[PDB]
């Protein structure tokens, strides 16, 4: 589902990409070949969000920005294949669990769960929450991974 009573303003700011689960080997491999620094969530010039991710690739700092357009309900967004992105659960000041699925085109084959943490190294219980969520969503244990982090690029 989507986080009930989702408050976008409390979801803004700095998050760390701590955990990932995907049914795409290509995407898993791509993400694992990098080191995550931080992500920043900010309101876009429309009712959606800009998600700016900073990471290290071959010792080079890089950034990518993703526009998450509103999808007609709070906590639900769209990214253009087209993908649905949902904030399924969050307490705003510790963690957020995101879920993405293709909604149009070949991307429909694609599913991804993400654990965002307000701290770069998340508590063990946060990791358990994520694993439990991924298992509930039909991800195999081997696809549930915690991404390499970097202190650089901050
Ligand atoms: C608009 C897309 C921007 C994605 C930036 C995400 C930052 C993660 C680091 C490297 C991305 C390389 C993998 C390509 C798949 C897109 C990742 C995703 O689902 O967010
Ligand atoms: C962290 C914010 C989530 C962003 C939502 C977009 C997720 C990924 C979109 C690119 C998918 C590329 C995967 C190709 C694999 C396949 O289609 O089988």
UniProtKB/Swiss-Prot annotation:
Tissue expression notes: Abundant in the brain and CNS, where it is expressed in tissues of the blood-brain barrier and secreted into the cerebro-spinal fluid. Abundantly expressed in the heart. In the male reproductive system, it is expressed in the testis, epididymis and prostate, and is secreted into the seminal fluid. Expressed in the eye and secreted into the aqueous humor. Lower levels detected in various tissue fluids such as serum, normal urine, ascitic fluid and tear fluid. Also found in a number of other organs including ovary, fimbriae of the fallopian tubes, kidney, leukocytes.
GO biological process: gene expression; mast cell degranulation; negative regulation of male germ cell proliferation; prostaglandin biosynthetic process; prostanoid biosynthetic process; regulation of circadian sleep/wake cycle, sleep; response to glucocorticoid
A cellular component term, taken from the record's GO annotations: Golgi apparatus
Interval of the full protein contained in this chain: 29 to 187 of 190
Assembly information from the UniProt record: Monomer.
Source domain of life: Eukaryota
Protein name as annotated: Prostaglandin-H2 D-isomerase
Annotated S-S bridges: 61-153
Alphabetized GO MF terms: fatty acid binding; prostaglandin-D synthase activity; retinoid binding
Function in brief: Catalyzes the conversion of PGH2 to PGD2, a prostaglandin involved in smooth muscle contraction/relaxation and a potent inhibitor of platelet aggregation. Involved in a variety of CNS functions, such as sedation, NREM sleep and PGE2-induced allodynia, and may have an anti-apoptotic role in oligodendrocytes. Binds small non-substrate lipophilic molecules, including biliverdin, bilirubin, retinal, retinoic acid and thyroid hormone, and may act as a scavenger for harmful hydrophobic molecules and as a secretory retinoid and thyroid hormone transporter.
Broad enzyme group: isomerase
Keyword check for NAD: no
Changes after translation: N- and O-glycosylated. Both N-glycosylation recognition sites are almost quantitatively occupied by N-glycans of the biantennary complex type, with a considerable proportion of structures bearing a bisecting GlcNAc. N-glycan at Asn-50: dHex1Hex5HexNAc4. Agalacto structure as well as sialylated and nonsialylated oligosaccharides bearing alpha2-3- and/or alpha2-6-linked NeuNAc are present.
Record organism: Homo sapiens
UniProt family annotation: Belongs to the calycin superfamily. Lipocalin family.
Record's catalysed reaction(s): prostaglandin H2 = prostaglandin D2
